[PDB]
UniProtKB/Swiss-Prot annotation:
GO annotation terms (biological process): [2Fe-2S] cluster assembly; cell redox homeostasis; hemopoiesis; intracellular iron ion homeostasis; iron-sulfur cluster assembly; protein maturation
Modified-residue entries (N6-succinyllysine), positions: K30
Annotated compartments: Mitochondrion matrix
MF (Gene Ontology): 2 iron, 2 sulfur cluster binding; metal ion binding
Protein name listed in UniProt: Glutaredoxin-related protein 5, mitochondrial
Function, in words: Monothiol glutaredoxin involved in mitochondrial iron-sulfur (Fe/S) cluster transfer. Receives 2Fe/2S clusters from scaffold protein ISCU and mediates their transfer to apoproteins, to the 4Fe/FS cluster biosynthesis machinery, or export from mitochondrion. Required for normal regulation of hemoglobin synthesis by the iron-sulfur protein ACO1.
Family the UniProt entry places it in: Belongs to the glutaredoxin family. Monothiol subfamily.
Oligomer status and interactors: Homodimer. Interacts with ISCU. Interacts with BOLA1.
Organism: Homo sapiens (Human)
């Protein structure tokens, strides 16, 4: 695969790099998958679970200020939900809503050896 993580630091890009390299489905919201923080937090988890993807790491960026400000700066954005696949940027919650429905997430999942459960319909 793509080799493992090992770095650390205070919200720094070299730490955020190792953070997206902790899983193949690293999800990122000001909140949790189990409680609606603010708008569009379930829209990412609906798309993932429909595709058969339920074992992501959902990162709450309110838990640590370094997660918060680290992801805001790394994205150059004030607020998102995101998902990174294989540590690569892949999109925020507005982008995911386009790519789901065109089917470009499905080819991205096939790079990892993951199978969209919309194939078995």
């Amino acid at each position: 695969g793509s080799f493992t993580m090992g770095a650390g630091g205070g919200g720094s890009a070299e730490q955020l790099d190792a953070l997206v390299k902790k899983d193949k489905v690293v999800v990122f919201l000001k909140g949790t998958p189990e409680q609606p923080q603010c708008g569009f937090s379930n829209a990412v988890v609906q798309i993932l679970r429909l595709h058969g993807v339920r074992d992501y790491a959902a990162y709450n960026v309110l838990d640590d200020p370094e997660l918060r400000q680290g992801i805001k700066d790394y994205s150059n954005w004030p607020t998102i939900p995101q998902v990174y696949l294989n540590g690569e940027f892949v999109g925020g919650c507005d982008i995911l809503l386009q790519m789901h429905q065109n089917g470009d997430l499905v080819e991205e999942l096939k790079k990892l050896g993951i199978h969209s459960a919309l194939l078995d319909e």
